Amino acid sequence: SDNVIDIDLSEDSPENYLLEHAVDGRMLFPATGTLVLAWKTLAKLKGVEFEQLGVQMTNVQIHQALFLNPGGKTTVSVSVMPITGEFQVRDGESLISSGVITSSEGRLLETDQHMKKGSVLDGKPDKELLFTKEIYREFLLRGYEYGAAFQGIQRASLDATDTDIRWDGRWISYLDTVLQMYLLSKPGTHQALPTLLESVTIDPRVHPAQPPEGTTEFQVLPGKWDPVLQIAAAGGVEIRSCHSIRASRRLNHDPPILEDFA
Amino acid sequence: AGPNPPKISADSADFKELVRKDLAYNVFKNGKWGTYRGFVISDADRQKERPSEYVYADWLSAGDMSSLRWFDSPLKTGHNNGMLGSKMAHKLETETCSVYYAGLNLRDIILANGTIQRDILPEETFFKEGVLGVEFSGRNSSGKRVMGLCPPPALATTVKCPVSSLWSVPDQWTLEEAATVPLAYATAYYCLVSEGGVQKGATVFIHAGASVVGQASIAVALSYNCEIFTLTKNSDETALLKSMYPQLNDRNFCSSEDCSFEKYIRKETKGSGVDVVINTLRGKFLKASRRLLSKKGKFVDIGFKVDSNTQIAYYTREHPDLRFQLDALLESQGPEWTRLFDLVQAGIHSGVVKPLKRAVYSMDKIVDAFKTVEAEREAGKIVIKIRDEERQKVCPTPRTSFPAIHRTCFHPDKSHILVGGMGGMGLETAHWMVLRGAKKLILTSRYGITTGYQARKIAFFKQLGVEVEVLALSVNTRKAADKVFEHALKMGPVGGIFNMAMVLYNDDFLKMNREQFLKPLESKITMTMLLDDKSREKPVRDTLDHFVMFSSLIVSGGHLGQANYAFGSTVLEKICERRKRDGLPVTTPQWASIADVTIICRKYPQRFFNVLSVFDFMMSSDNVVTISYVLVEKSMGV
Amino acid sequence: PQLNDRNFCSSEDCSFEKYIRKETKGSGVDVVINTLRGKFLKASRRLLSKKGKFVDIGFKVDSNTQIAYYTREHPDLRFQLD
Numbered sequence: 001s002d003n004v005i006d007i008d009l010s011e012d013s014p015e016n017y018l019l020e021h022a023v024d025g026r027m028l029f030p031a032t033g034t035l036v037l038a039w040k041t042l043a044k045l046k047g048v049e050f051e052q053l054g055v056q057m058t059n060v061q062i063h064q065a066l067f068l069n070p071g072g073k074t075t076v077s078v079s080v081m082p083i084t085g086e087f088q089v090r091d092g093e094s095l096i097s098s099g100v101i102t103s104s105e106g107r108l109l110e111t112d113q114h115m116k117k118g119s120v121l122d123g124k125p126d127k128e129l130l131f132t133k134e135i136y137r138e139f140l141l142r143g144y145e146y147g148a149a150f151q152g153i154q155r156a157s158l159d160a161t162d163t164d165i166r167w168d169g170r171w172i173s174y175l176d177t178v179l180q181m182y183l184l185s186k187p188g189t190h191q192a193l194p195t196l197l198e199s200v201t202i203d204p205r206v207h208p209a210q211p212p213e214g215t216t217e218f219q220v221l222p223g224k225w226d227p228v229l230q231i232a233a234a235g236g237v238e239i240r241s242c243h244s245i246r247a248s249r250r251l252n253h254d255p256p257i258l259e260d261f262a
Numbered sequence: 263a264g265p266n267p268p269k270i271s272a273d274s275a276d277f278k279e280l281v282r283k284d285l286a287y288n289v290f291k292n293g294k295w296g297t298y299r300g301f302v303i304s305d306a307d308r309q310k311e312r313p314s315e316y317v318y319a320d321w322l323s324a325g326d327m328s329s330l331r332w333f334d335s336p337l338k339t340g341h342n343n344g345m346l347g348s349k350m351a352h353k354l355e356t357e358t359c360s361v362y363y364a365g366l367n368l369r370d371i372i373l374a375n376g377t378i379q380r381d382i383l384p385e386e387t388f389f390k391e392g393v394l395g396v397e398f399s400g401r402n403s404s405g406k407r408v409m410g411l412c413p414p415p416a417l418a419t420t421v422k423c424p425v426s427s428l429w430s431v432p433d434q435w436t437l438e439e440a441a442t443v444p445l446a447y448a449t450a451y452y453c454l455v456s457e458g459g460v461q462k463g464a465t466v467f468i469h470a471g472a473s474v475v476g477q478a479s480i481a482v483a484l485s486y487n488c489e490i491f492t493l494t495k496n497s498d499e500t501a502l503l504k505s506m507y508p509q510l511n512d513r514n515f516c517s518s519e520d521c522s523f524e525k526y527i528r529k530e531t532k533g534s535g536v537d538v539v540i541n542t543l544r545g546k547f548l549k550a551s552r553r554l555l556s557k558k559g560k561f562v563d564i565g566f567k568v569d570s571n572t573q574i575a576y577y578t579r580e581h582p583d584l585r586f587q588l589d590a591l592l593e594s595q596g597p598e599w600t601r602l603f604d605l606v607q608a609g610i611h612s613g614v615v616k617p618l619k620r621a622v623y624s625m626d627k628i629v630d631a632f633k634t635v636e637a638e639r640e641a642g643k644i645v646i647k648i649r650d651e652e653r654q655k656v657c658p659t660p661r662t663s664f665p666a667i668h669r670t671c672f673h674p675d676k677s678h679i680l681v682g683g684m685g686g687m688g689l690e691t692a693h694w695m696v697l698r699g700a701k702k703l704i705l706t707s708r709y710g711i712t713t714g715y716q717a718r719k720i721a722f723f724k725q726l727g728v729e730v731e732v733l734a735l736s737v738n739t740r741k742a743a744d745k746v747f748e749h750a751l752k753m754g755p756v757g758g759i760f761n762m763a764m765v766l767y768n769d770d771f772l773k774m775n776r777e778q779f780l781k782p783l784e785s786k787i788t789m790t791m792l793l794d795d796k797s798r799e800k801p802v803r804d805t806l807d808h809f810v811m812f813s814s815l816i817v818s819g820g821h822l823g824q825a826n827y828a829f830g831s832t833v834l835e836k837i838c839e840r841r842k843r844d845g846l847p848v849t850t851p852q853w854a855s856i857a858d859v860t861i862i863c864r865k866y867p868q869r870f871f872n873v874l875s876v877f878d879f880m881m882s883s884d885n886v887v888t889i890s891y892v893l894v895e896k897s898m899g900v
Numbered sequence: 901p902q903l904n905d906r907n908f909c910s911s912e913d914c915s916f917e918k919y920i921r922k923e924t925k926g927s928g929v930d931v932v933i934n935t936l937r938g939k940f941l942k943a944s945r946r947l948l949s950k951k952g953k954f955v956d957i958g959f960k961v962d963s964n965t966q967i968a969y970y971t972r973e974h975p976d977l978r979f980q981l982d
């Protein structure tokens with residue numbers, strides 16, 4: 001009923017970076033991608049620009065997976081209740097995301113990570129650091145296939161508590177890379193599908209502005225993982241208490257051919 | 263070679279017979295000329311069931327109750343998989359019991375059919391081989407007949423039940439009847455006397471009175487001289503309950519088909535309400551049942567299919583989650599459990615805890631038993647019969663075997679050496695063994711830990727509770743081999759040797775000197791006969807269980823430029839075939855390409871989660887060399 | 901006099917959740933006597949231990965909270981002494 005968003009997955013569309021996010025081959029819309037759609041919708045209802053609005057999404061339920069299709073157009077309807085903030089990202093007549101989105105003018109962010117300036121992972125040996133090749137080898141082993149657009153964590157500590165998160169002006173990528181810090185904080189072998197984000201605070205006012213046009217080298221924003229409070233904070237974003245459900249890992253290819261060399 | 267070995271030498275007789283057929287590959291083995299061929303293994307053989315002394319029930323595909331099979335149990339090693347993390351803190355004293363009957367609850371059906379994931383269960387069960395089954399009735403190590411609740415998998419043939427959860431079967435119940443008592447009555451006492459605080463003469467409303475927990479709740483409530491209101495689906499359930507409990511009159515029964523029980527119960531309690539509500543029904547029946555609560559009434563919600571809002575309430579600590587609390591008390595086995603242990607034991611002595619009516623399903627109808635529980639077409643306990651109770655009352659359990667699918671497991675008290683285990687498949691295979699039982703790893707590399715991915719993985723094994731040791735040495739001389747087994751035997755008996763080491767110099771054969779042709783031949787011809795000489799001597803020979811030597815499909819297909827690697831990979835496979843000739847354990851995976859750790863020779867690289875699925879079959883098999891490769895598509899013509 | 905500064909937090913922010921969680925070594929607080937509401941009520945149930953009890957005695961309950969009282973979902977403990 002409210003904003004209808006069209007995602008153009010075409011050859012040169014500006015939102016073609018969204019096909020670089022797959023889980024076991026299938027292309028998927030990021031779980032923290034309907035947060036931006038709800039974020040942009042609420043700002044549109046208020047008449048303000050979405051990057052000047054500080055929102056807070058609470059108890060965001062992910063009911064389905066929005067399967068992207070190359071060279072195709074996906075139309076999703078976002079419906080936000082004026083006063084209470086109840087939002088609904090629904091493709092056709094199927095719900096993909098639900099929750100409550102609330103804007104504010106005060107300080108919503110709990111952690112003070114938005115004030116951190118530099119990267120604490122400076123001067124460390126190469127054997128005490130995780131680089132993007134090593135970070136995304138661990139995700140690939142679990143089925144999360146991220147292309148160059150979604151490879152935002154450029155460096156991290158062995159504990160994955162401290163990280164360097166890339167800021168490229170694309171908010172679906174940035175929110176996903178701040179959820180990758182939570183995923184990087186739960187080592188394992190299974191594939192976990194997010195099902196509930198208890199809180200998601202986005203405050204672009206304390207976030208750096210979009211990089212100049214045509215930028216090739218982007219800045220890295222320090223990120224931190226809080227095990228005590230379970231908050232993945234980087235820049236002006238904060239994801240709290242994300243809950244995931246084990247997903248059966250599907251085979252990209254056909255079954256292997258086993259033989260007895262005799 | 264037979265008694266008449268061939269004499270292939272220049273102008274010989276056998277050779278000329280071979281220069282006339284002009285066949286590319288001539289192999290004289292087992293007394294006849296032949297060739298090495300890769301014979302396909304049918305997909306049905308991957309799930310072939312073989313006799314196994316210890317087995318346990320799991321699912322081949324999560325969320326499918328028709329995929330339930332019996333797999334090998336890690337209890338053959340004496341211990342149980344999943345001793346990592348929080349399961350390492352509680353050092354509960356456990357008695358090893360031979361399960362004879364296993365009761366099927368609705369907790370297993372909910373997990374088996376995918377209604378709830380394994381992650382909702384207590385965190386101590388995350389790494390367990392299975393999560394199906396809690397109650398059982400079998401025989402402890404002394405031959406006594408015992409029944410009790412244990413952390414899963416109790417749908418197995420052997421269990422390790424904590425001594426604080428084991429009751430003794432009275433000498434009037436068959437083990438069949440004992441299998442029905444423990445969970446149904448332990449839950450009933452928890453809901454009524456531990457969470458509801460039922461007092462004498464209190465009014466209790468019990469949903470689904472025909473369920474095993476419902477039948478137990480009525481029996482516990484009647485012993486407390488309570489006014490019972492129960493919800494019965496049809497008239498058959500009402501008749502069954504009335505016959506089972508003569509104290510129950512028709513006024514004590516309502517219908518689970520409508521919320522018309524609210525007006526009836528409110529009128530029959532004169533507006534006082536019901537002191538305890540054991541709630542299983544959901545939606546408007548949950549709302550109409552809280553509305554019957556008295557001023558001090560307690561609402562015990564034990565239904566499994568909670569709504570999304572209810573789960574968020576559980577997460578936000580708004581409400582307590584009481585539907586996996588008996589499973590959580592079984593992991594801690596503390597003051598709150600020993601209160602339920604004593605309540606049930608007292609009930610057995612006082613006659614309150616009587617066995618329920620049950621239907622016995624064999625071990626091969628496990629799927630049908632689960633379907634019977636799910637449908638809930640008729641009241642009763644579904645009890646899987648694992649063994650046949652002996653006529654005696656204290657007698658050793660005969661040793662028998664059960665048909666079960668393979669499941670590789672590693673002894674946690676033995677040390678496993680991984681030569682080249684500080685790499686891509688070395689470290690991801692090591693993690694697989696850690697989940698399957700290994701807790702003593704000695705990983706060997708030419709340099710040790712040199713990257714932050716290796717240092718983060720090893721710091722993960724150690725946190726899980728694994729005794730890791732990283733040696734920066736190459737096992738290419740007897741001194742190096744001795745050191746790796748001095749460190750292995752210091753950690754524990756050697757129970758596995760793995761050789762994932764690879765060195766590759768790809769080049770054209772005619773642009774390669776000896777120093778460059780013998781490059782890949784160290785990790786494959788020199789570390790395989792220094793690990794095979796050391797595994798053929800005491801004490802390694804008796805303790806060793808696995809001898810895995812990774813190979814490549816270059817020995818079966820060939821490759822361009824890798825003529826030195828092919829020589830090394832083939833001589834490695836010939837050492838492993840010699841091990842089979844001598845009856846020693848040996849496994850030689852011959853992998854094509856691995857993805858996570860593109861199209862080469864028209865073969866797609868496999869995902870690692872699928873390499874470990876076929877690797878598990880590779881280890882639990884009788885052949886030596888197994889070729890695993892994925893085809894882009896079945897070949898057509900030209 | 902038995903109260904030291906470590907035993908005190910601020911009612912102006914929900915910064916007491918990290919402090920108390922760290923000071924209890926992740927065990928939580930056994931009893932919560934809650935008067936503050938909103939994000940301070942949520943941050944205080946989140947400090948509850950496994951067996952912890954939450955005694956909410958604030959008077960200015962939200963609309964959803966009152967419906968919970970009406971539906972018997974939660975007990976109303978703010979006029980129980982009366």
Ligand SMILES: NC(=O)c1ccc[n+]([C@@H]2O[C@H](COP(=O)([O-])OP(=O)(O)OC[C@H]3O[C@@H](n4cnc5c(N)ncnc54)[C@H](OP(=O)(O)O)[C@@H]3O)[C@@H](O)[C@H]2O)c1
Pocket residue numbers: 681682683684685686687688689706707708709710735736737738761762763764765784785789812813814853854855856857859
């Ligand atoms: N993953 C694949 O693409 C693939 C495909 C087909 C077959 N395979 C099979 O799997 C293995 C390769 O797996 P991978 O390369 O992904 O991981 P990996 O086997 O763990 O990597 C090879 C390791 O060998 C170690 N190494 C080499 N020479 C050694 C020596 N003399 N002593 C001790 N360690 C030594 C190296 O340790 P350092 O680096 O510290 O020196 C290196 O980490 C081979 O056995 C191969 O047949 C793999």
